[PDB]
A paper describes a structure:
Identification of [name] as the factor that impedes infection of myeloid cells by HIV and SIV brought to light an intrinsic cellular antiviral immunity mechanism that relies on controlled reduction of deoxynucleotide triphosphate (dNTP) availability. To counter this infectivity block, HIV-2 and SIV viruses encode an auxiliary protein Vpx, which targets [name] for proteasomal degradation and facilitates infection of noncycling immune cells by these viruses. In this study, we show that the allosteric binding sites of the enzyme are plastic and can accommodate oligonucleotides in place of the allosteric activators, GTP and dNTP.
To gain further mechanistic insight into the interaction of [name] with nucleic acids, we determined structures of SAMHD1114–626 bound to the phosphorothioate-linked deoxy(C*G*C*C*T) and the phosphodiester-linked ribo(CGCCU) oligonucleotides by X-ray crystallography. The structures revealed that bound oligonucleotides span both allosteric binding sites A1 and A2 and engage many of the same residues that mediate binding of nucleotide triphosphates. For example, the guanine nucleobase of the sole G nucleotide within the oligos is accommodated in the guanine-recognition pocket of the A1 formed by [name] residues D137, Q142, R145, and R451. The key difference between the oligonucleotide-bound and nucleotide-triphosphate-bound structures is that in the nucleotide-triphosphate-bound tetramer, the allosteric ligands in the A1 and A2 sites make contacts with residues of three distinct monomers, whereas in our oligonucleotide-bound structures, residues of only two monomers are involved. The structures also offer insight into why phosphorothioation increases oligonucleotide-binding affinity. In the d(C*G*C*C*T)-bound structure, histidine H376 appears to form a hydrogen bond with one of the nonbridging atoms of the phosphorothioate linkage between the G2 and C3 nucleotides in the oligo.
Numbering used by the authors:
A (entry chain D): 114 to 276, 284 to 305, 308 to 506, 515 to 522, 546 to 583
B (entry chain A): 114 to 276, 284 to 303, 306 to 506, 518 to 522, 546 to 583
The structure:
Amino acid sequence: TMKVINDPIHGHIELHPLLVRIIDTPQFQRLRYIKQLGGGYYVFPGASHNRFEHSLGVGYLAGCLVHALGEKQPELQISERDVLCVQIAGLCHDLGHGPFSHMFDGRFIPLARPEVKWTHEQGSVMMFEHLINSNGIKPVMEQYGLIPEEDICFIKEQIVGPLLWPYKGRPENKSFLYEIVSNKRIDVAKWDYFARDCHHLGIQNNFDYKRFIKFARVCEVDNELRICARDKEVGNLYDMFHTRNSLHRRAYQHKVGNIIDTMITDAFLKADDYIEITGAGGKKYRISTAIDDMEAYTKLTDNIFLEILYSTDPKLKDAREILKQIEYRNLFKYVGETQPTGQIKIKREDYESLPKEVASAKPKVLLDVKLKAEDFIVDVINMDIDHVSFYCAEQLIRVYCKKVDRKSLYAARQYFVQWCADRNFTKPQD
Amino acid sequence: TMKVINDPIHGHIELHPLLVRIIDTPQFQRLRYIKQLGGGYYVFPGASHNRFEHSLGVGYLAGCLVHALGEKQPELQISERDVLCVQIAGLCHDLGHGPFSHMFDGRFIPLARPEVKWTHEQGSVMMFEHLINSNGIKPVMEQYGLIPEEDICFIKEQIVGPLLWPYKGRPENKSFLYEIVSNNGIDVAKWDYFARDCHHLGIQNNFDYKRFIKFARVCEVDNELRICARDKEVGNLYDMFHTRNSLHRRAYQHKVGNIIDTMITDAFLKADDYIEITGAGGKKYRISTAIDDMEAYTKLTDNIFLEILYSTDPKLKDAREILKQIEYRNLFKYVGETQPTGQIKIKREDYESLPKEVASAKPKVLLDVKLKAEDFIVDVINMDVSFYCAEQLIRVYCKKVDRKSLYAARQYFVQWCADRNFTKPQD
DNA sequence: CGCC
DNA sequence: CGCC
Ligand SMILES: [Zn+2]
Ligand SMILES: [Zn+2]
């Protein structure tokens, strides 16, 4: 006797009582107010979904994979305690996302605070412990057969990775369990958001996850235990990689969608000094420092968009006038694309310095109106098959300009070509 | 070649440039921030959709059907102007919705101001005219061949209805055009949200609108030009009505979803005196009076939920703590259901008085625990073809959820339905 | 009662 | 450039 939540992707999702008492907290329900695809909704109107229902799907998928593993191979000693912590890990892996998901830690906090190293996964670890303490979950955890001190750290390890054996939460015989929720070397997170995102985007999904689950086993490579699929399933995995490619080309890397993300990020930056969120002890925080106090971060969601847009505050009129140009669909303009040469990749610490480098370049022929750094938006688009074990351009740089007259736009495209020449990046096309 | 919006229900939606220039206004994009099912999202997580994408679907379908009618029967004199005005009517039928959709005008405003008579359709008319003047749409209309005065009133009439022939926007040789956007109860708006809601709820819809449009035509019935389908497709409509029945019993009238709607309304009522929305000329409005100025109403959306939830103001803690019991899933509890069979139905004007009645009734059998009116919620759920070859439910919830309060509440409910001659509640 |  |  356990609770059921109806889901359009997975149908009925049965929830162990302990999962229910993690979901029914303000820290988890927070995910109802953060859109999964960020500003992609302003391009795909079917993409209204938030991290909340996605994380229900990931928790469900995680639990159905290891319970299927434990029933096909009982020799692997998979307690139902192990299933409860894998389910909790999938449920909370996204707890640390901020407004508009990957826009927040992928762009905004790099540009507002290049010094800090911040990821949503660290956010999830912090928010997970804030969730556990504020709602008295540690007693409820042992009541359902979990050992909190070792099992909370097991949960945290599944979300954020390691600190021979780097993991303290599970022994090395249960190594396979760490490949389920987030495998950073195919995980149940991409299973859900591949199906969910195409459902809302109108893209077809030819990956069948339930057919991957039923024929999946744990095999041995390296003397290490891994999750492995049948030779009969390579056609399915060719499909998994194809829809991942179409989701990226068509949605995640959409040209208009990515510009709008950087427009929202611009409005946050110009609002960052004047917006206050009350955290612990009345301490007031800002959008960029809310990540330092979880009580404030809990109230940092996509709501900050509408609060800026609905504001009367005169100090917020630069930010408010950017969000208002999104409604009028007068956006930054697409100058061009380029990719870093070799395996070299740009780093978040240097994002802020990118528009100043482009303005400093000297093009071949002079034009009267000259551009400064603030006329440029430099957009760094990162994406992140034979590592799959059976048995029987990763970075894009796009440049936009906030000037939309034809003479500014030509000039902007001659500071982009020179910048590429200077850094020896691939030459832009048309 | 024109702008294209990819939609999960309809695929590609081509939009006339004029439609693009009303969509890309703050008054229309406002619908991105109003959930289609209101609080149903707190029960069905797939139901994250908003009025914006629904209204895109209605403008598309409206133009599809009218273009199909003019293509099969050119005798009917259907110009571009008529289809552009039918499309605009479909796009803007829902402009007047408030936070959480039907909750706002169906419950909140009756309880916050039982005096005034308000509907979202009157809102859509008011907001449509605010959209047109603030965004300089009247010249753009002229550009594409529209006559503003008669074509704007034609659009308003399609939304909210008229004031022999009651309509001033089109003659009766074009009588059929008023049957498309809002109606029999078969309009292109219910086609979209049946498909859209079932897509996001996981309910299955096998009603085919695309072939109902293809075999539809206008016909003569009792002195009148009306839209008609082949008697061939009674089978298509039997399925449409089944999915309407499924969406109502399973989703629209869900017991917990409706309880949460009345919890959100309760927090709105307790926040209504302390929330300020700035309208035209800096003039400040409240949640219940923002409907009086469209410049303020533009900024009244579901965001107001999170403004209450994230507030520090001490005057907003009664409201904030109701929304906090939604997050903790400690909700009002279901006491019972009844119907006024055989009786004058409850009216929005009487809504406020209903809890005081329930708490004033008390059976021949007394018990120790005794409730007051604010401990009760009274929820009034209202339900509301030519071919060619339970009206009202009242549910009662209690805000005290201990076993002894709930037992009493169920004995004030059983005796309030004998006092009102409503049907006896069953178990 | 995020199962009608 | 809410079509890739
Ligand atoms: Zn995820
Ligand atoms: Zn509608």
